[PDB]
């Protein structure tokens, strides 16, 4: 179950229909570090880049009545969906974000093994297509080494 998502993950790519959300300074330009399951809720420590420094924040995505849908408060309300996952290799999620009368779609790919990140970018591109994003709305994070001290 959810507990198999526990442990170390590495962010590979983001996508959004609102480019500002995933720009280098954007609300959802954050790096996953680790996840854990507690009470069937999904807990996650993320790393937030901030002017050469980096903040570690613990978030909880709360289970809902819908399988694989979670409530996450982060820059507004998010309906967080676990779209595709192999707990031992990769995880694709997307969120419907409600913030200040704006509604946006944000997707996120993470992997267990960064040397394999190329293996799963196509699966991410396909999920993005299915939720209506195009390939030019994807940002690959391989040039963004901020928070490198915390991302080991």
Binding site for Mg ion (CB under 5 A): 145
CB of 145 to Mg ion, least distance (A): 4
Q: How far apart are CA 67 and CA 1, in angstroms?
A: 12
Query: What are residue 42's phi and psi, to 5 degrees?
Result: -95, 120
Between residue 64 and residue 93, which ones bind ligand ODM under the rule CB under 6 A? 72, 74
The token duo for 30 is 């954050």
* Upper half-sphere CA count for residue 83 (Cβ side, 13 Å): 21
Report how far apart, in Å, the C-alpha atoms of 110 and of each of 92, 100, 102, 127, 137 are: 7, 28, 26, 13, 17
49 scored as a contact of ligand ODM (CB under 6 A): no
CB of 21 to ligand ODM, least distance (A): 8
46 scored as a contact of ligand ODM (CB under 6 A): yes
The enclosing H or E element of 123 equals: helix 117-130
Nearer residue to Mg ion within complex by CB, 85 or 140: 140
Nearer residue to Mg ion within complex by CB, 86 or 145: 145
44 scored as a contact of ligand ODM (CB under 6 A): yes
List 2, 13, 47, 61, residue binding ligand ODM (CB under 6 A): 61
18 scored as a contact of ligand ODM (CB under 6 A): no
With CB atoms as reference, the residue minimizing the distance to ligand ODM is: 44
108 scored as a contact of ligand ODM (CB under 6 A): yes
């Amino acid at each position: 179950g959810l507990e198999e998502l526990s442990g170390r993950w590495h962010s590979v790519a983001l996508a959004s229909n609102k480019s500002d959300l995933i720009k280098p300074w954007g609300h959802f330009r954050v790096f996953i570090h680790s996840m854990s399951a507690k009470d069937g809720n999904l807990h996650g420590d993320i790393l937030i880049p901030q002017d050469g420094q980096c903040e570690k924040v613990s978030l909880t995505a709360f289970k809902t009545a819908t399988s694989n849908k979670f409530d996450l408060e982060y820059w507004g309300h998010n309906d967080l969906y676990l779209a595709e996952v192999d707990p031992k290799s990769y995880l694709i999620l997307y969120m419907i974000n409600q913030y200040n009368d704006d509604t946006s779609l944000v997707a996120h790919l993470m992997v267990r093994d960064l040397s394999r990140q190329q293996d799963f970018l196509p699966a991410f591109e396909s999920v993005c297509e299915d939720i209506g994003l195009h390939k030019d709305q994807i940002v690959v994070l391989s040039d963004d080494d901020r928070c490198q001290g915390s991302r080991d």
